[PDB]
Write a protein that binds this DNA or RNA. Structure first.
Ligand SMILES: CC[C@H]1OC(=O)[C@H](C)[C@@H](OC(=O)NCCCOCCC#Cc2ccc3c(=O)c(C(=O)O)cn(C)c3c2)[C@H](C)[C@@H](O[C@@H]2O[C@H](C)C[C@H](N(C)C)[C@H]2O)[C@](C)(OC)C[C@@H](C)C(=O)[C@H](C)[C@H]2NC(=O)O[C@@]21C
Ligand SMILES: [Mg+2]
Lengths: 175, 215, 122, 37
RNA sequence: UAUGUUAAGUGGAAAAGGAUGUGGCGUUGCCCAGACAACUAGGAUGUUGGCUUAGAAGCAGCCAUCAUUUAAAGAGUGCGU
RNA sequence: UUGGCACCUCGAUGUCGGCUCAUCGCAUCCUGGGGCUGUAGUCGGUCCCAAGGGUUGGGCUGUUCGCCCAUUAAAGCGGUACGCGAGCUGGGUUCAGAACGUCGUGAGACAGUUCGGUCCCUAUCCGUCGUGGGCGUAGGAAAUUUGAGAGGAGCUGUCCUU
RNA sequence: GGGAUAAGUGCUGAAAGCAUCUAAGCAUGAAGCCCCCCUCAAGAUGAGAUUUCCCAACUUCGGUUAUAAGAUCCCUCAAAG
């Protein structure tokens, strides 16, 4: 696995506590704690960490590269942070806050409210651009998906909550 | 939340605020007394037992349930109460709002609650498939000899048997039935009567277990 | 209680002097109807002339019945004959008058032109 | 979603993948999404 | 007991066909001059030149498909009408 | 389904429709979730997941079927001895009467029509629906009980609002 | 109204430095599954739980009377048959 072996990781002003299996990364923006694969072992030199597979078996390899990028995501995220941008297109389609929760007005004859969680923060911009931010890449991904599932883009006028810079295949149905 | 043991007296009618005829049943709840307070660590589930009516006290040589037997006198004297005739218990209630020995009074119910009345049906005795099971009966003419009996009880060689649950003649009645989402129109505290909109199960002079709707 | 194969009088000047019913609209398996309910029916006696002629299939509304109706206060209104009125698929009559009394319950069904063109609302 | 015992690429942009036991094609043309086979 | 195979309860019912499921044995064309990835590095020129076709210059169809601005380049590998 | 085979049943396994009662499969008719579309939403078409429930009343024929008239959200396809006659009918078909057309010299014949034509049985066992008694639950009793399990429900329309 | 799911939709993610719903993990999702709602249910021989009532005196050794507490016989009845 190139991802796993070849690409060595780079702890940058963070504290990667490899406590046996359960690792514990902390830095500017907070602490993330995961249990990585058992059979794998880790070699932390100065300002660098390296993952090693036990064998050359498919299992050991598919797992190897998987939780070598799951460390990088933690260290790269507890230091620089992970953010997702969602745009809202459409006459009357808005985006507004309410005590760290997000009310959405997307033409649903009812206001939709996404409540926020730990280590996660929402923000709007010109009432159209929502922004989810946090340290886990899989929370920023989970929430941003939840907020696009409210009204995903449609194929005729593109109206809906689209990821910033996401190709919306536009059909041209006519009257 | 609330529960009272009563008995059914009959049905009448009341007129409502806008003139509507309200069909009602008169239920008589009097001297409902708590006799125990079941608890989770003592019995495994928290609830309270209410005794209704009033039997006479023990007498030697009693020949009827009119008088209490020695076993029941003791159970009721531990709650300083008189021997009672009907004993049931309630789980929906908060066991800590009741005390062993209190009277449950008709006024527990205010006008416009939602209650469930659980009684026993009236006995119809041994009946047949058309009254007991609502079955369409056969032709009464055109040379028929199949007037009221139930039809086929099965198939043929496949399942050379009658399946369980085949709706056949027998006793009708004597079943606990719970009508749901009834309401009380008035509670009278002096004659001790809770009036309930609609109709309830049972013969006249029966027993109904009114408590608060679970829905 | 009006079911199919029931003959009703027409209380209007549509042409139809008397009609019988086929179905009671309002539901699968619906069997009966009372005041304020619509039925499909085919006239059996027409006036010479008139807009509706004999043997036609028509929508119609029940205006009075012998079974009659309970009202919310325990008051009952009964009548001495079944009766009906033809409609133009807009809750409006086909004829220009309306003969005989009508029950107040037709007000609710928005058969207002039937209630307005009536000798007695009851 | 076509479910056909024969799942094969329809376009050059068509990728056969094996998800959860089933040989499927995911493509950018939603018409070319296929499932069994 | 030894050495290997399967991951489907296959074992413990079918078939034409379909498949980056996995194991073995060869054969092979490429690769430290550094093939293979997205390697986010350039992508166009007289020029659709000729038949230019609904005008249509990678699409309604004959392609005549010339050298390279160039480490790498095609009258465009190609998604398009 | 139309057949082929002739393996159980001729010391008899009542055969067609209808009625009463159902029960099960899903290759789903409606309802629920979806991918789609040559889907702008209503529209429809296609495919997938789905069997919980529901899945009309009549005219015509003995008819199953089919056609037709009104509805419905839909008016599903099959198994069950083409489910069910010791539960019912007996219109069709299949006894004896008769008659027409046809064939036969004739007696008679036709799966050609037509009118008429006896549906027996007091339930032993298993099964099933209710209802008692005996005994066991390490004393004899009166009352209140948890719930291992089991059964029942489970459908859906229109209008208004946005 | 919960909980777990079906087709499906994803999130992070490598084998296969790209991708990618999948292999680890973790989400969402149906009149369907489980609970929730109604009823029967300790012959549930695993025979369960709570409260109360009854409690001696002959044995020559219980393989013991008769009695408690409790019922029944019998009789007047029906809200039951
Ligand atoms: C009243 C008590 C007696 O019962 C009975 O009469 C019942 C009613 C009778 O039911 C039936 O008719 N079938 C059910 C009705 C079937 O309709 C279809 C239309 C037809 C026909 C037809 C065809 C040919 C002939 C025929 O050719 C001819 C002639 O003269 O040649 C005379 N006609 C009349 C024919 C008529 C019993 C049950 C009958 O059995 C049944 O017959 C069949 C042969 C087989 C049946 N299975 C095996 C499928 C069988 O179950 C018998 C034969 O009775 C005649 C029963 C025998 C034992 C008796 O003799 C008993 C003692 C009766 N005698 C009496 O006095 O008590 C009786 C019990
Ligand atoms: Mg024999």
């Amino acid at each position: 696995s190139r991802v796993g072996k070849k690409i060595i990781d780079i702890p940058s002003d963070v504290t990667v506590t490899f406590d046996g299996n359960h690792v514990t990364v902390k830095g500017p923006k907070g602490e993330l704690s995961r249990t990585l694969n058992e059979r794998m072992t880790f070699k932390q030199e100065e300002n660098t960490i390296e993952v090693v597979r036990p064998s050359d078996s498919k299992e050991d390899r598919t797992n190897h590269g998987t939780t070598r990028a799951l460390l990088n995501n933690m260290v790269q995220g507890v230091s620089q942070g992970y953010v997702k941008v969602l745009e809202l297109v459409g006459v009357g389609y808005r985006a507004q806050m309410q005590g760290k929760d997000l009310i959405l007005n997307v033409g649903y004859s009812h206001p939709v409210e996404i409540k926020a969680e730990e280590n996660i923060t929402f923000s709007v911009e010109k009432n159209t651009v929502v922004k989810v931010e946090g340290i886990s890449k899989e929370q920023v991904g989970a929430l941003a998906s939840n907020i696009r599932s409210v009204r995903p883009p449609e194929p005729y006028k593109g109206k809906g909550i689209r990821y910033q810079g996401e190709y919306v295949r536009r059909k041209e149905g006519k009257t | 939340t609330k529960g009272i043991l009563g008995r059914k007296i009959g049905m009448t009618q009341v007129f409502g605020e806008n003139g509507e005829l309200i069909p009602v049943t008169v239920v008589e709840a009097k001297e409902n007394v708590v006799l125990q307070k079941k608890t989770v660590e003592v019995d495994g589930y928290n609830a309270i037992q209410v005794g209704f009516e009033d039997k006479k006290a023990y007498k030697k040589d009693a020949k009827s349930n009119k008088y209490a037997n020695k076993p029941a006198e003791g159970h009721a004297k531990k709650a300083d109460a008189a021997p009672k005739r009907f004993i049931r218990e309630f789980r929906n209630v908060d066991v800590d709002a009741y005390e062993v020995g209190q009277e449950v009074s008709v006024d527990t119910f205010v006008a416009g609650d939602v209650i469930d009345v659980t009684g026993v049906s009236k006995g119809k005795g041994f009946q047949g498939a058309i009254k007991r099971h609502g079955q369409s009966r056969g032709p009464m003419s055109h040379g028929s000899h199949f007037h009221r009996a139930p039809g086929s009880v099965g198939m043929a060689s496949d399942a050379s048997r009658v399946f369980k649950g085949q709706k056949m003649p027998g006793r009708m009645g004597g079943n606990t039935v719970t009508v749901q989402n009834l309401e009380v129109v008035q509670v009278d505290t002096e004659n001790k009567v809770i009036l309930v909109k609609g109709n309830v199960p049972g013969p006249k002079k029966g027993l109904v277990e009114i408590r608060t709707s679970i829905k | 209680m009006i079911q199919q194969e029931t003959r009703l009088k027409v209380a209007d000047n549509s042409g139809a002097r008397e009609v019988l019913t086929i179905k009671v609209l309002g539901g699968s398996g619906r069997k009966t109807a009372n005041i304020g309910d619509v039925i499909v029916c085919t006239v059996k006696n027409a006036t010479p002339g008139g807009v509706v002629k004999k043997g036609d299939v028509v929508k119609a509304v029940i205006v009075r019945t012998k079974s009659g109706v309970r009202r919310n206060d325990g008051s009952y209104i009964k009548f001495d004959e079944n009766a009906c009125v033809i409609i133009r698929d807009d809750k409006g009559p086909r004829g220009t008058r309306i003969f005989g009394p009508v029950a107040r319950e037709l007000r609710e069904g928005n058969f207002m032109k039937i209630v307005s063109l009536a000798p007695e609302v009851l | 979603m076509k479910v056909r015992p024969s799942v094969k690429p329809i376009c050059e942009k068509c990728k056969v993948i094996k998800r959860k036991g089933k040989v499927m094609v995911i493509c950018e043309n939603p018409k070319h999404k296929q499932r069994q086979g």
